[PDB]
Amino acid sequence: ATKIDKEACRAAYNLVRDDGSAVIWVTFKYDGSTIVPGEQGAEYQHFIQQCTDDVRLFAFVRFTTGDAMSKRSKFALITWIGENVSGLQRAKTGTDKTLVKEVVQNFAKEFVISDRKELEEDFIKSELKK
Incomplete structure (x- = not known):
């Protein structure tokens, strides 16, 4: 029933x-069952924050x-799941990520x-390097 x-x-x-x-950054959150x-x-x-x-x-x-x-941009798709989020919602987020990707097509x-x-900015950059 998750929608977007x-x-x-x-x-x-x-x-x-x-x-x-x-x-430089935007988020997508759940408002009930709609992202x-x-x-x-x-x-x-x-x-x-x-x-x-x-x-x-x-x-x-x-x-x-x-x-x-030589300045260039690299975009990242980030799914953030706080330690207090339940195991079930944690799993749901993983499934719903597909719906998000239908929009966030390039990264x-x-x-x-x-x-x-x-x-941490520098950590993410080193990761994007790989």
């Missing part, structure tokens, strides 16, 4: 893939590496994270 507002979520997705946009857009932001540290132990969420984030003429790598330490 494709239109709304696709707009958030595209907002991030747009270079002429200041928004809808959650918060968005231009500063990555504010994304980490949305990832608490009590919640779960999907996120599409633009990371930037290089500089000047360099996808992650399933429960430890904020693994959200």
Whole structure:
């Protein structure tokens, strides 16, 4: 019965893939049985603040590496599941990720994270490197 507002979520997705946009991260959260857009932001540290132990969420984030003429972007699909989320909802999130991917079609790598330490900007970058 999980549903998704494709239109709304696709707009958030595209907002991030747009270079002429200041928004580098957007989230997708459950509003009852429907996945809808959650918060968005231009500063990555504010994304980490949305990832608490009590919640779960999907996120599409633009990371930037290089500089000047070598500056380039790499997008990541991140599924965040707080340690307090139940085992059953934890499993459900894994299944529903398929629905999210119907919108988040392009990304360099996808992650399933429960430890904020693994959200540290430099860690994610080293991962995207691989």
